[PDB]
């Protein structure tokens, strides 16, 4: 037997903190976590233990180590069907990746509404607070391939498949409340401009190249979502710590037939948090799978991603009441004008079993709505409805992608559609058409009605000529980017400046940089000037005299647009690095771990080598990673306990660990003789807001560190970090 006798190959089927056990398929890690969708997949889950190895035809294999040959040094024979089946399968493993959002990470979970919403919608999944709907969610980046890195600067996708009793509803959103373009006709142009350039296929996962900024400089409608992407919104800390938005205005339809306009929101119950650029870009090198890993391990730990679904509702009579068009997906609806009403809660509580079968093959599409919902004439949403059914014909091999197990509805589905590649369902209906008498016309149409009704489109009035023309109301491009700019804290504004400065410095053709800075002068001169100075461009007198755009219905700022202006911090699920030494003061470690445990914060024990170290009281401490192997980039704060500090005080990696954490605005805590590390990062003996220090690690020490962590980063340190060489 190849397993170790102690059973240490196999993870415990209980929640455990990140790193404590090897990760495992969901159904093995959490066998008792169920929901109607998870259960329904049992027909296709395949075990392995105690079973014979076979071909795909069920023939047991005696020797899976050798090809069939004529003599043991002889040629391989064509009659080796075992070799050829295995190699043929392998040779055809790959399927086309998604045209956009190819890089993504997913989990199973459930949603339920807080109260019935039957006064505004007849959608069944929102009709009953005690009716649970399983979900499957995929989070993604946009530009890079399926093997690109997670912590790039990009917009993030947040797609939710709701397996309702009246059909699948897919809410296919992003983490910013607008898109870059107005009309779907332009999507291939925009996507080609952001994607790797076609001659050399560079750069991966980066908008920082000429063709993207060329498109931006020529299409000012892009500027709003570009401001979002250049802010710290572009580099979330975790999929758990970003917002979601459906972007488009949709309709809700109630049983009386009344339509209300709606925009959809997800509020992360873990709070909003992002990285800083230098950290994000280095993390794509040190751990290109960091968000994928963090999501999977939060779920294994019981730190389940939770989000609150929220609706901005606007009555039909108020369609034209703002100074922007509701159907323009480059405009946001400020929550100061239309509040987000809380609707329900979604909990992600199980990882998939096989990433390819469940994540790679999942198909989401915003056209998959249910009775009680409907579309609007938003010209971006209108073209998305064509694309998501079409692309699955090549990506998933044919028109039967709904029979791939992750995509299957859990409610009944019956119709007269037949055949297609890899057809699974065997229809027994004598009829494959309707109307028919030979099956008494089953399956039959259902009239629309208050519940369990057929889908009917809201009878919106259409009046105009057949035209390819952009609505004049869409031709305003600068006021929303300006509202966003003015809503950010001063440090968030600095990071926006630095985002544009860094990206445009990688554009080789200087005139493109100049044209972008001229667009910025149409938004805000302080922003335009700060970017120009980093690019060595001087604004012209004319540019300095551009009139700022109008306020948005009187608003000079809306703090809900900022990540940080209103505290919402939650430490549960975060992780602290603990830098060990070979004689750790076990009293410090007791106090540190007790306080972390009470707040659901995880620890990773690091040292200069792997294996174990023994603390002052004999406690054996297994080492999670070396200082170089698990860099500060990967944690939220660093604690250095007392002990034999001499052991690590001259270690370059341990000093660098602190210098990188300090540069990246993370809280650092130093107990006892670990305070000698203050010399490495400057710090007055008097101390610094953001560095916790004391004779020992105790109640008070841990309290201060935990309070720092609830504020996420130490923004006050920003002016101290330009001078530090790290």
**Of residues 279-338, those binding ligand HDD (CB under 6 A):** 329
**Of residues 171-210, those binding ligand HDD (CB under 6 A):** 172-174, 179, 184, 187
Q: How far apart are CA 664 and CA 633, in angstroms?
A: 8
DSSP state of 618: S
SS (H, E, C) 504-545: HHCCCCHHHHHHHHHHHHHHCHHHHHHHHHHHCCCCCHHHHC
Given the residues 35, 101, 224, 359, select the one marked as catalytic.
101
Site track 89-118 with ligand HEM (rule: CB under 6 A), x = hit: --x------xxxx--x--------------
CB half-sphere exposure, 284, CA atoms < 13 A:
20
- Tell me which residue has tokens 């703002």: 322
Locate 383 and state its tokens. Answer: 């073209």
Q: Give the sign of the dihedral formed by CA 274, CA 277, CA 280, CA 283.
A: negative
Q: What is the DSSP string of 352-369?
A: -S-IIIIIIT----TT--
> Which stretch in 166-174, 199-207, 367-375, 493-501 sits in contact with ligand HEM by CB under 6 A?
166-174
CB of 388 to ligand HDD, least distance (A): 4
Applying CB under 6 A, what is the total number of residues that bind ligand HDD?
28
CB of 384 to ligand HEM, least distance (A): 4
Report if residue 212 touches ligand HDD, rule: CB under 6 A: no
How many CB atoms are located within 10 Å of the residue 597 CB?
12
**Of residues 66-95, those binding ligand HDD (CB under 6 A):** 87, 91
Given the residues 35, 108, 174, 265, select the one marked as catalytic.
174
Nearer to a second copy, 360 or 588 (CB): 360
Collect all residues with Cβ–Cβ distance below 8 Å to 437 and sequence separation of at least 6: none
CB of 70 to ligand HDD, least distance (A): 19
Name the binder of 171 from a second copy, ligand HDD, ligand HEM, none, CB < 5-8 A by kind: none
> Which stretch in 210-218, 386-394, 436-444, 611-619 sits in contact with ligand HEM by CB under 6 A?
386-394
Q: CA nearest 37: which of 362, 416, 494?
A: 362
Locate 191 and state its tokens. Answer: 């996507």
Question: According to CB under 8 A, which one of 1, 4, 618, 719 is a site residue for a second copy?
Answer: 4
Where helices occur in 369-452 by DSSP H, the ranges are 379-395
Nearer to ligand HEM, 215 or 677 (CB): 215
Report if residue 177 touches ligand HEM, rule: CB under 6 A: no
Locate 600 and state its tokens. Answer: 């659901």
CA dihedral 463→250→246→313, nearest 10 degrees, is 120
Applying CB under 6 A, what is the total number of residues that bind ligand HEM?
29
Nearer to a second copy, 3 or 684 (CB): 3
CB of 518 to ligand HEM, least distance (A): 26
Report if residue 710 touches a second copy, rule: CB under 8 A: no
Nearer to a second copy, 11 or 600 (CB): 11
Locate 319 and state its tokens. Answer: 């369609």
Report if residue 286 touches a second copy, rule: CB under 8 A: yes
Q: How far apart are CA 516 and CA 495, in angstroms?
A: 17
> Which stretch in 56-64, 160-168, 342-350, 544-552 sits in contact with a second copy by CB under 8 A?
56-64
> Which stretch in 305-313, 391-399, 495-503, 592-600 sits in contact with ligand HEM by CB under 6 A?
391-399
Report if residue 16 touches a second copy, rule: CB under 8 A: no
Applying CB under 8 A, what is the total number of residues that bind a second copy?
156
Q: What is each CA distance from 694 to 483, 597, 640, 685, 688, in whole angstroms?
A: 44, 21, 11, 12, 13
Nearer to a second copy, 154 or 166 (CB): 154
Nearer to ligand HDD, 198 or 447 (CB): 198
CA dihedral 80→82→88→93, nearest 10 degrees, is -160
Report if residue 363 touches ligand HEM, rule: CB under 6 A: yes
Collect all residues with Cβ–Cβ distance below 8 Å to 385 and sequence separation of at least 6: 366, 367, 375
635: helix, strand or coil: coil
Number of residues written out for the chain = 726
- Rounded CA Rg of the chain: 28
Report if residue 377 touches a second copy, rule: CB under 8 A: yes
Q: Is-catalytic flag, 101?
A: yes
CA 67 to chain centre: 44
CB of 522 to ligand HEM, least distance (A): 23
- Beta partners for 54? 60
Report if residue 470 touches a second copy, rule: CB under 8 A: yes
- Beta partners for 606? 579, 625
- Beta partners for 251? 261, 374
Q: How far apart are CA 214 and CA 195, in angstroms?
A: 13
Ligand-binding site membership of 110 (annotated) = no
Q: Is-catalytic flag, 174?
A: yes
- 503, 230 contact by CB (below 8 A): yes
Site track 56-95 with ligand HEM (rule: CB under 6 A), x = hit: -------------------------------x---x----
Locate 580 and state its tokens. Answer: 């060990």
Nearer to ligand HEM, 101 or 263 (CB): 101
Name the binder of 294 from ligand HEM, ligand HDD, a second copy, none, CB < 5-8 A by kind: none
Q: Maximum CA pair distance of the chain?
A: 91
> Which stretch in 250-258, 278-286, 580-588, 635-643 sits in contact with a second copy by CB under 8 A?
278-286
User: Applying CB under 6 A, which residues contact ligand HDD?
Assistant: 87, 91, 98-101, 104, 138, 140, 157, 159, 172-174, 179, 184, 187, 247-248, 329, 363-364, 380, 383-384, 387-388, 391
Judged by the rule CB under 6 A, the positions of this chain that interact with ligand HEM are: 87, 91, 98-101, 104, 138, 140, 157, 159, 172-174, 179, 184, 187, 247, 329, 363-364, 380, 383-384, 387-388, 391-392, 395
Question: Residues with catalytic annotation?
Answer: 101, 174
């Amino acid at each position: 037997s190849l397993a170790p006798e102690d059973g240490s190959h196999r993870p415990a089927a209980e929640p455990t903190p990140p790193g404590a056990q090897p990760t495992a398929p969901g159904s093995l890690k959490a066998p008792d976590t169920r929901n109607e969708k998870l259960n329904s997949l049992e027909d296709v889950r395949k075990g392995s233990e105690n079973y014979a190895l076979t071909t795909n035809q069920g023939v047991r294999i005696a020797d899976d180590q050798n090809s069939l040959r004529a003599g043991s040094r002889g040629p391989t024979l064509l009659e080796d069907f075992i070799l050829r089946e295995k190699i043929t399968h392998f040779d055809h493993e790959r399927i086309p990746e998604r045209i956009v959002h190819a890089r993504g990470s997913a989990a199973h979970g459930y949603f339920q509404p807080y109260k019935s919403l039957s006064d505004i919608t007849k959608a069944d999944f929102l009709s009953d607070p005690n009716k649970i709907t399983p979900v499957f969610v995929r989070f993604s980046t946009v530009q890079g391939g399926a093997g690109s890195a997670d912590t790039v600067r990009d917009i993030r996708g947040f797609a939710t498949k709701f397996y309702t009793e009246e059909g699948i509803f897919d809410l296919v959103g992003n983490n910013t409340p607008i898109f870059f373009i107005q009309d779907a006709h332009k999507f291939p142009d925009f996507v080609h401009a952001v994607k790797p350039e076609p001659h050399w296929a560079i750069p991966q996962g980066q908008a920082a190249h000429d063709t993207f900024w060329d498109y931006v400089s020529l299409q000012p409608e892009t500027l709003h979502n570009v401001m979002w992407a250049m802010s710290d919104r572009g580099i979330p800390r975790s999929y758990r710590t970003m917002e979601g938005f459906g972007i488009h205005t949709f309709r809700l339809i109630n049983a009386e037939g009344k339509a209300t306009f709606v925009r959809f929101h997800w509020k992360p119950l873990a709070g909003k948090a992002s990285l800083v650029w230098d950290e994000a870009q280095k993390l794509t090198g040190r751990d290109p799978d960091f968000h994928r890993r963090e999501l999977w391990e939060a779920i294994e730990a019981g730190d389940f991603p939770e989000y609150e679904l929220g609706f901005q509702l606007i009555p039909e009579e108020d369609e034209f009441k703002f100074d922007f068009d509701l159907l323009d997906p480059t405009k946001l609806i400020p929550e100061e004008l239309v509040p987000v009403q809380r609707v329900g809660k979604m909990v992600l509580n199980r990882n998939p079993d096989n990433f390819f079968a469940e994540n790679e093959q999942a198909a989401f599409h915003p056209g998959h709505i249910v009775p009680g919902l409907d579309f609007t004439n938003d010209p971006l949403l209108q073209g998305r409805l064509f694309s998501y059914t079409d692309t699955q014909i090549s990506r998933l091999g044919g028109p039967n992608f709904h029979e791939i197990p992750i995509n299957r509805p859990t409610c009944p589905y019956h119709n007269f559609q037949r055949d297609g590649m890899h057809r699974m369902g065997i229809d027994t209906n004598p009829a494959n058409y309707e109307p028919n008498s030979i099956n008494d016309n089953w399956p039959r149409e259902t009239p629309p009605g208050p519940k369990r009704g057929g889908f009917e489109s809201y009878q919106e009035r259409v009046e105009g000529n057949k035209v390819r023309e952009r609505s004049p109301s869409f031709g305003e491009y600068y006021s929303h980017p300006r509202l966003f700019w003015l809503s950010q804290t001063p440090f968030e504004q600095r990071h926006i400046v630095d985002g544009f400065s860094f990206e445009l410095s990688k554009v080789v053709r200087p005139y493109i940089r100049e044209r972008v800075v001229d667009q910025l002068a149409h938004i805000d001169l302080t922003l335009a000037q700060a970017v120009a100075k980093n690019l060595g461009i001087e604004l012209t007198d004319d540019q300095l005299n551009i009139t700022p755009p109008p306020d948005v219905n009187g608003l000079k700022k809306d703090p809900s647009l900022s990540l940080y202006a209103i505290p919402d911090g939650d430490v549960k699920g975060r992780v602290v690095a603990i830098l060990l030494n070979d004689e750790v003061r076990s009293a410090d470690l007791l106090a540190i771990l007790k306080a972390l445990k009470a707040k659901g914060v995880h620890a990773k024990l690091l040292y200069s080598r792997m294996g174990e170290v023994t603390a002052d009281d004999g406690t054996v401490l297994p080492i999670a990673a070396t200082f170089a192997g698990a860099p500060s980039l990967t944690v939220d704060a660093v604690i250095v306990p007392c002990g034999n500090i001499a052991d690590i005080a001259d270690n370059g990696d341990a000093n660098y660990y602190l210098m990188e954490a300090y540069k990246h605005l993370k809280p650092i805590a130093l107990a006892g003789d670990a305070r000698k590390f203050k010399a490495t990062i400057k710090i007055a003996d008097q101390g610094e807001e953001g560095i916790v220090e004391a004779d020992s690690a105790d109640g008070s020490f841990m309290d201060e560190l935990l309070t720092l962590m609830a504020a996420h980063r130490v923004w006050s340190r920003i002016p101290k970090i330009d001078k530090i060489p790290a």
